[PDB]
User: Fold Cytochrome P450 3A4 from Homo sapiens.
Amino acid sequence: HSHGLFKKLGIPGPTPLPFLGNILSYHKGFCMFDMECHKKYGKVWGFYDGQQPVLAITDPDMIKTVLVKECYSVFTNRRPFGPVGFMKSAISIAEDEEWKRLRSLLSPTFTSGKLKEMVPIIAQYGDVLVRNLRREAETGKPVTLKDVFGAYSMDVITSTSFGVNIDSLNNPQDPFVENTKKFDFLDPFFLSITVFPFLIPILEVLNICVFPREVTNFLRKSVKRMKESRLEDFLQLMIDSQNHKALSDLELVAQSIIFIFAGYETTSSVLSFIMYELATHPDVQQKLQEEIDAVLPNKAPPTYDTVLQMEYLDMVVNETLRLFPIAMRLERVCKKDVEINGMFIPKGVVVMIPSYALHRDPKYWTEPEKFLPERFSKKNKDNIDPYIYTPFGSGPRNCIGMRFALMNMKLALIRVLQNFSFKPCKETQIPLKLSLGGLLQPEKPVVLKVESR
Amino acid sequence: HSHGLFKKLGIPGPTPLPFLGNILSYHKGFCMFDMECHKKYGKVWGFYDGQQPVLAITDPDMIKTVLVKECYSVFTNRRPFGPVGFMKSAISIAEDEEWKRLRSLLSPTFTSGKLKEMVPIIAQYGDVLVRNLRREAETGKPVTLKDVFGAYSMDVITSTSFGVNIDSLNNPQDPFVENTKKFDFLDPFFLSITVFPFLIPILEVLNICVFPREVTNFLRKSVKRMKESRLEDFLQLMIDSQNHKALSDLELVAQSIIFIFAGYETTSSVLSFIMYELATHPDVQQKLQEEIDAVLPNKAPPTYDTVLQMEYLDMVVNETLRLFPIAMRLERVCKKDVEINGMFIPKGVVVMIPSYALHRDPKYWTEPEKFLPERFSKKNKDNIDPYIYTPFGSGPRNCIGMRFALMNMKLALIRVLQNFSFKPCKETQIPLKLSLGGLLQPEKPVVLKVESR
Ligand code: HEM
Ligand code: HEM
Ligand SMILES: CC(C)(C)OC(=O)N[C@H](CSC[C@H](Nc1ccccc1)C(=O)NCc1cccnc1)Cc1cccc2ccccc12
Ligand SMILES: CC(C)(C)OC(=O)N[C@H](CSC[C@H](Nc1ccccc1)C(=O)NCc1cccnc1)Cc1cccc2ccccc12
Assistant:
């Protein structure tokens, strides 16, 4: 069918198999496949997710044209994702004018002004974090980060989005925590999708959701109770906004679901990659406790302004995100016949930017596998192309939650490094192995020793 | 396609719509549709679940030929059910020689000899039931039966099948309880099945299970730990039996899953229908406490022999099961061109016995909507056709768990009625309304007052 498209256009790439395309090559994971394609083929190449053509690009100008210059015109949507059900209306999933509308209604939620109002609340849970860490540091029993971080990141969402305040590590079975804890793009299911994308319309008419039909109905009503218990946070910022069109009720639920997830799994996963790097680089960790103590003496509480003051803290976070950009790739569907930077791109091709591989290219990064926060010092931070280093994307469809994510993680680190130091255990996987699957997550979970200062 | 089959054969029935068949008629539920078809059409009739022909029969001789005489030859399997995944091997689902084999390997599990050994264990949880009922009887706050009964019935399964001992009402969040608590044949999904049965093979290759891919994998390993923590109950009776073919590992998991469910949802639901009837018939309830006190004076513990001694207890249970046969219908797929009792039945037709309607036919039951346990007294119990009253089916494929179910429920009742009496509350739905959906369960859950004797 559409297997001859790259041979024709003169773009190189691995030869596709009938039906499967190049997907057997995902057996080492997206990231390794991207690195190898990049090395073997240069600046542009092509491959087929089943029948779907995918054009990878690594030129910073071309990348900017896709993500910024020609976003509204050509490269507006992400790869069709399904089956979604009513989550078709979630901002990260929606398309064209429905997205533009949702991006407009939801943008003022993420300003610096509202972000500054959420700091005192994310603080109270920064303490709750300490108390549950102290119990396991005074009990010299190794600690699993995703649990305690996830409990924290869960605590921050529920509060920043609905007010619900829970000790999710100590109230792990409170129902509002159950639902909310519940996508491996290389598991039995989504591989079957790529080989049978004609099956998505089938699953839709069958009221099948990759977002289980149960969790969603919990929040559809949890919201429409809160909706009627508030006028009788994120949700509030959304109800107040339905006062360019009417932000409906079920749409409001779908945004909540996307925010809940992002602020939980992404935030907690990144915070775990950081503490790993800090533990396997003891000096970096010490240097940061020194900076935190210098800006916040006597273990003083971090404020909004003192967080943006801490520069090595910023350097550490950016560097972790270099080595582990949790999105792995950025993507846009080409909606017209177009030509950008001298190259013809036909309609329907997915254009892909392989962030993970670019973050680790030796043609922009010296010793790229090494954790070296100094790359981001205000001296060298100018020698870093913002279209090579893109942990939050770029352009009108970049990560809306970027400012909040950064602030959330950094307040976690500050209140935690004030009180504790983190040391590799015996059971600590060194060096960390990335999941061979479809997620930027560790092969084995991260386990470390903790000591009260 | 196959819509002309009953018009041809000369069998009456509602005219089918293209594609849908007669399924819009399920809008009052299977049970009402069966009663009306029975009244309007007589002893035999036909309808179409989509394209699938279904022949309903109500003649006791014909019924016995299907369920008993010609079971191995013609009417061996139940209606194909999907998508099932590895649960294809569960006994209630399997077919032909794979079923015969599993029915043979699993039958000795349910003898009177093993049943008598399980009594002391189902007893210890009969007490655990009392303590959690007393807390809500000394707190004059109405009680919801499915919860406390389900917690009990859950406690009996886990123990009778794997030894795991849990206070599931007080340990409601113990993980082994979580999984195990997790089919509406008229919900968005299964209606779509009947209209697109060609979609089941699609869902199978897509590793889609109506038994969620997660709960199953919990027990697949929970078993293969117990498998290796036992030689280093039901499960034991099965591992000991793999010592006519080798009972494999994944097959063992699939039987456990079917047993866990049946012993939980069926048992707890029936026990809730009984206490409703007892509360809305105060004399019946009193009479049974008198019989229990007479056989077990001083609130003496029930034994295996004293349970089979109690006859009004038997009368009460049978009568409840008359009014609420939780299976609603029995079914067999006709696998050959055949003729039974003067009627030609072609290959592939589902033959259906509408138990609910027959249990409520005024042509065998006087005042059938009334709860009258005397119908089952040893005087009148002979005027009751065992192919009209069939709460557990009949023949080689009848309910394997019948003896155990009866024993389990009755030990619950005895230890509970010894200590408490049950009274209708204000919020008590009288008369009980049956679910308009695809389950023999109450519209509103059953809530009753409880008083310590
Ligand atoms: C460390 C945490 C996070 C990282 C590294 C991250 C990264 C990203 C990336 C790479 C994208 C795609 C951008 C593009 O295609 O140009 C994205 C999109 C998005 N992110 Fe995040 N993200 C994070 C956390 C969050 C959080 C906490 C939220 C909370 C609201 C959030 C909400 C979104 C949304 C809604 C989108 C889609 C935006 C749109 O399509 O208009 N993200 N993120
Ligand atoms: C009050 C409780 C129960 C009732 C009213 C009930 C009723 C039934 C009915 C009507 C059938 C279909 C019989 C037929 O088609 O002839 C059946 C099948 C079955 N029941 Fe039960 N049942 C109950 C509890 C249980 C329990 C506790 C178990 C535990 C193992 C169990 C295991 C099975 C199995 C395995 C089958 C399928 C048998 C086969 O296909 O070989 N049932 N039950
Ligand atoms: C767990 C991890 C980090 C290894 O993998 C993913 O997170 N799995 C995404 C799944 S599908 C769209 C997704 N909803 C969703 C998913 C699960 C539960 C509820 C809702 C979503 O947008 N979450 C917000 C988010 C996630 C990450 C960074 N910032 C924001 C992959 C994905 C798919 C499509 C577009 C994306 C755009 C940006 C980022 C990820 C995208
Ligand atoms: C909840 C209720 C009582 C209103 O409705 C059903 O229980 N939903 C059955 C579903 S599918 C086969 C089923 N597995 C299964 C189901 C759920 C979770 C795990 C396994 C099964 O066999 N459970 C054993 C059982 C159930 C009832 C009485 N005794 C034994 C309907 C069903 C389907 C096919 C054959 C059946 C044969 C006998 C009885 C029911 C059958």
Observations:
- Chain B has one domain: 1-453.
